[PDB]
Write a protein that binds this DNA or RNA. Sequence first.
RNA 1: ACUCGGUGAAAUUAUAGUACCUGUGAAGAUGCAGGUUACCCGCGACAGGACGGAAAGAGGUGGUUCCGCAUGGAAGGGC
RNA 2: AACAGUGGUAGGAGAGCGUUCUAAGGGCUGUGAAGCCAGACCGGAAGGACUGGUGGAGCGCUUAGAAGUGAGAAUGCCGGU
RNA 3: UAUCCUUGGGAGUCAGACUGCGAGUGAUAAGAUCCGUAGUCGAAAGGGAAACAGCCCAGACCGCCAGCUAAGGUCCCAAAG
RNA 4: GUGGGUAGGGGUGAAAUGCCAAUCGAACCUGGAGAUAGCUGGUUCUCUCCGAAAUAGCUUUAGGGCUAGCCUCAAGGUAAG
RNA 5: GGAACGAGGUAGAUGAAGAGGUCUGGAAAGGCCCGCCAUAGGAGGUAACAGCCCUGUAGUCAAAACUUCGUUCUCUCCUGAGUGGAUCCUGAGUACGGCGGAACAAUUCCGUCGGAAUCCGGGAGGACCAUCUCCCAAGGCUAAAUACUCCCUAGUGACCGAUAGUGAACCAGUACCGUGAGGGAAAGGUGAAAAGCACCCCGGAAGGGGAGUGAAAGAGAUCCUGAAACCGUGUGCCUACAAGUAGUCAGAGCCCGUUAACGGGUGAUGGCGUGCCUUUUGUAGAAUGAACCGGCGAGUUACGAUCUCGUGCAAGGUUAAGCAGAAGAUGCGGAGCCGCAGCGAAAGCGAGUCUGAAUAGGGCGCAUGAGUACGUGGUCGUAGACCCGAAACCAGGUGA
RNA 6: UUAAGUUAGAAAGGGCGCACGGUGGAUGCCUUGGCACUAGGAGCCGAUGAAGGACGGGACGAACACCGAUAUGCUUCGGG
Lengths: 118, 117
Amino acid sequence: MKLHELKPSEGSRKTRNRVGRGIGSGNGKTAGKGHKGFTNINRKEYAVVNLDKLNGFAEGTEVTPELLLETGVISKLNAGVKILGNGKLEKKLTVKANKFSASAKEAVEAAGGTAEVI
Amino acid sequence: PRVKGGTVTRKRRKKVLKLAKGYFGSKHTLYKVANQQVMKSGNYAFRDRRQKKRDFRKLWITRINAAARMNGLSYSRLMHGLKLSGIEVNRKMLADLAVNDLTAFNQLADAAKAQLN
RNA sequence: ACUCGGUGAAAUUAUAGUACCUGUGAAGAUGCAGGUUACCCGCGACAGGACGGAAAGAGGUGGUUCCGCAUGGAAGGGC
RNA sequence: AACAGUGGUAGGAGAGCGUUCUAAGGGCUGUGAAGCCAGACCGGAAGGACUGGUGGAGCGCUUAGAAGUGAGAAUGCCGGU
RNA sequence: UAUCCUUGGGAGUCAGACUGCGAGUGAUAAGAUCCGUAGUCGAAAGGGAAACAGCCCAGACCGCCAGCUAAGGUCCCAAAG
RNA sequence: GUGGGUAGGGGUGAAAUGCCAAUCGAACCUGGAGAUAGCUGGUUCUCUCCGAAAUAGCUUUAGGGCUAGCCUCAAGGUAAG
RNA sequence: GGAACGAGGUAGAUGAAGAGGUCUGGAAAGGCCCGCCAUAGGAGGUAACAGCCCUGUAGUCAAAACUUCGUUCUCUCCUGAGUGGAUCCUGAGUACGGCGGAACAAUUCCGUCGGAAUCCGGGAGGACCAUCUCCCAAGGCUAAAUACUCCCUAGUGACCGAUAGUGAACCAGUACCGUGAGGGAAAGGUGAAAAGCACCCCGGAAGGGGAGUGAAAGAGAUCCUGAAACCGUGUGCCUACAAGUAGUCAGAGCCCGUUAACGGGUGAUGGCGUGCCUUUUGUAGAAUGAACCGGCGAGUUACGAUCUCGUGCAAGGUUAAGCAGAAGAUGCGGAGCCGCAGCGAAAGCGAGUCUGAAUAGGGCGCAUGAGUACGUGGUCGUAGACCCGAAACCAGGUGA
RNA sequence: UUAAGUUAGAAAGGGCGCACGGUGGAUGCCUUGGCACUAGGAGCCGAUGAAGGACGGGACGAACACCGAUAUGCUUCGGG
């Protein structure tokens, strides 16, 4: 791209509409304006890592709140990690979460991995 | 940056003042009245380009009426006879020429007379 | 005041080659319609119009296990 | 190509013309630049050339970028008459 | 016959005027009184009614010194018996 | 005549406008201050497409504002109108 | 408290290379054909546009005398660590309480009265009552990182270019106005060089006409260029029987001859024709504004919200302050932010979950993922917020 | 010659176009002056009389600038 043949991407730049510069532009005399007119003290809020996130959670054998955040799957750990029963996680893998759901519990136990709770 | 501007204003006003050449008194000198007169002239020119087509037909009809009454007919009877003979394709304008330049066009009046009987 | 010699302003001002009558018309027509009059340019008067200015009228009773002060009691909960 | 369409205030939408500056490429110009004056030229409009005179030293083209961006009305402000 | 539904962005507008029908209203003829209901102007030029915002005919993209008609007209002004 | 005094929610000693530097029903100058105004006037180049409203319900409503009605642009439903 | 070394500041010194030839020209730095220097191609000037003509620039240096910093010498000054813990100290009308206003269980300030403890001692963790956790009040002193610049030095602008930019490019806070506080202008340009007109002629002079200088004198002192309004001289066509928003369409005659074009100027006669703007239901009006010409004169910027388009990456997307780097790009910095699930006031659970006895009903949410970081554009909100224009109120002053 | 008819031309001044001037300072080029910042300095002067001024000083007028009865300048140390 030479400095004398600069072309913008088609549609990225629009010309500003200047109001009040003649009656042929449609925005003349009147310039387009026409005529005269229970909260708690502290709440525990766990993070969420659905089974679908753990679906293909190759990441690491132990799904530690650390790895979760380290790899990036979970960001702000907030109060703590919580696995939720959404998805069909399918692979031999251990797990380490602060809290679990009923569906998450039965899925991890039917999988065959550990389900220790901090 | 700042933009001054004098050249565009001077040129745009000079074009109008040059279009107003030949008007009376202040109307070819001062920009404000010359602009008004030029706009009025544009309107008049449109209206009169229509009225010209209106007026030349009126002139043609008058001349045909005169030359036809020189033969014993009127304009209406002659036109009806001419149309009734198919020779009416001939216009009014061309008829009127063949009235100031060849009154031997009476041939046409004779044909209309023959058809009107 | 007027004529001649000298000197020399101001209010006002869309452009203007700016007649009269009878009608028409958003207020009252010079500028619209129909008619009637009128050679071109001045000077002095009048005060008619002057769309000139002046004017001036005019409840108790009565649910809550929610959290709970770092910790418990002790307090207090959206509705 | 065949039909159909093209009055317009408030207003909505679209496509453009010019001005100052900056960047890149290309150029003009003391054998005469910008500006000013005249003309019977070109485009659908905003506009753009070409000749002649004056002028006596700077200016413009292409593609982008940024705006103190275009005047006939404000009992506008300043100057000239 | 080609419109109408949803969602989203942007609006302007909130003293309308006159004319004709009704007969809803003094339901009768009304005038009234509003009520409806249609049209035009507003935002619409052109031809007619002498002149004429709202009446009658009719909706101007631009040229032509071509033709046919609408309302209204055909002794002269003034086109045509 | 000359030289002096009374100062602004004050003086001219309550009773008088007769006024306080062209200013007086509250002096003047600078600042808050580019005060505020629903009131008034103005808002600068061009062409193309489409094109309104002046009606109902609220607002201490007062020509101002809000919700419906009427306009335009885009995307979907599609063929419902 | 002195003394030696180093680097600065307040003057300066040195510093490469073309008269190249030739053309136009008043003049060469320009054109064309040739060479050179470069740690120097920043800038200004010179008769036009210069690297090599001048002043200069890069690089090297340089200070008698004042100063600003460093480094060293000199100078001056100077104990800490243990075992215990028999016995004393660890900040007086204070800590805290009443009493009123202040402020405003209330909250504190100040006064108005009171009034402890003190190591086994106190003070705190919203109050109180106990557990535990941190600290040690009523004495004092401390640089740096931060705020701003009337000034001085070196520079830099997609800043202005004489109605602009400071009010002030010029003997400007001047001239003027006012008793005073105070208010507050206008006004830049000969030419490269004065070479700025000897002399002759008309005229009292002013001012001209020659002569001369100069590239130019129509560059001659408000002396670059010089537009419009406004004012004149000459001339081609028309005009003294004619009623007009002054044009437009038709049209002879006369006079010309162009960016050669179904040319230009003027027009006797015929038809049609109630200015522009604002406002209003509606204007030609006895609604409103403009004497004319010229210049200046109004929808911006910052921070939030939201929508569309573009680009990157995508269930993930992104850095902020700072550090280094020409006031740059950029590199690193991942703390933080938005999204990837909802519901319930909360309590908690969870593709569901609250309400309701209800597995009744009901509400929301999944029930087929797209967001995020920038940029352009539209609109909204807060900032003087499109521009102009009141009466009033307050503060500090000046005037008999 | 008479009669009856037609036309032309006329400019006191004026209108349009053109040519040539005057007045007046827009426009274009230019910059002596500004505006906004950056990097460093420096952040006080005064009873040993300050900031700011009045009056004076040159061979010969007024004014600006500089200086103070030692008055358009004095001494010294450096540069040139």
